[PDB]
Amino acid sequence: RLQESISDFYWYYSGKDVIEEQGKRNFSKAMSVAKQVFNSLTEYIQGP
Amino acid sequence: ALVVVDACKAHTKATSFCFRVSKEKLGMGPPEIK
Amino acid sequence: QFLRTDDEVVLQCSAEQLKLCLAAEGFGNRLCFLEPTSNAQNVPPDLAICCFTLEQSLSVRALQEMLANGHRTLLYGHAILLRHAHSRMYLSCLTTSRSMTDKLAFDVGLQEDATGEACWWTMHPASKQRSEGEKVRVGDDLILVSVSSERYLHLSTASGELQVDASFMQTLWNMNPICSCCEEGYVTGGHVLRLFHECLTISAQRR
């Protein structure tokens, strides 16, 4: 659900080249929770 | 069906042909046609 | 087992339980009408008029970019571009209706142009059993809606016999893949060939 959200978020502004502030800050506080959900399933699998 | 008859009333007992090798006194499907 | 790109499908609906498939004439009488297949014990049906195949399954509106500008796995939510096997044409909808009843019931046909304005028809499930991104398969529930028009393929309940319309009426469909991508030299059901050993021919009522 996250990747099919942010993939269409990217496909929404692929037409404009230079991207401005608040859209990429909305990108930033989404990739900041992506920062932790990306390893929250890795400390389920690095166990022996 | 032996010559051709109409497909308006062509039924199962009239037109049903089949293919066999030589039959004695007796996913997708299996690959048997060459 | 599961659906992928480039399967010869046939769209079923069920209305006595009547089994109905959507047919295609081609080269004249462009608005396409149906043919029954529940009564196969008294009529041989025609399936070459309704071999339908899709080859492109892009995203929800992935041609956002291309309207201004191997075989992939399709999902629930993704778009369909259809193709016939007889006409080699694309399935679309025309905006001039043949209903003459002012109920906003448009009728579909096939278009020689390759413009993806009203030839793209995205996919949606019926119930909450499957959700967005789920696994498409045989024998499922289907709801199909367009992009630039977005009306649903339904059956006629107003007058005459039954035919397919595009209005605000949601009728469930069935995908039904029939022929997959099989190898060369190996015949499947619905391929023309000849029986040489002599040719199996008809003379010039010529029966």
Report on this model:
The structure is cut from a larger assembly and holds 3 copies of chain A. By secondary structure, the first copy, chain A, is mainly α. Chain A is 58% helix and 0% strand. Chain A is elongated. The relative contact order of chain A is 0.11. The B-C interface holds B 3-4, 7-12, 15, 27-28, 31, 33-34 and C 1, 41-44, 180, 182, 185-188, 207.
Q: TL;DR of this structure?
A:
Chain B: It is found in: Sarcoplasmic reticulum membrane. The structure is cut from a larger assembly and holds 3 copies of chain A. Chain A is mainly α and 48 residues long.
Features:
part of a larger assembly; 3 chains; 48 residues; mainly alpha; 2 helices; 58% helix; membrane protein; Rabbit; Ryanodine receptor1
Count of discrete alpha- or pi-helical segments spanning 4 or more residues of chain A:
2
Helix/strand structural class of chain A = mainly alpha
Oligomer: part of a larger assembly
Given the C-alpha coordinates, what overall shape of chain A results? elongated
H/E series of chain A: HH
Considering DSSP H and I runs of 4 or more, what fraction of the residues of chain A is helical?
55-70%
Major beta sheet summary of chain A = none
N-to-C span of chain A = 29 Å
Rg calculated over all Cα atoms of chain A: 14 Å
**Total DSSP E strands of chain A:** 0
PDB class: membrane protein
Keywords: Rabbit, Ryanodine receptor1
Entry title: Structure of RyR1 (Ca2+/CHL)
Chains A, B, C: Ryanodine receptor 1,RyR1
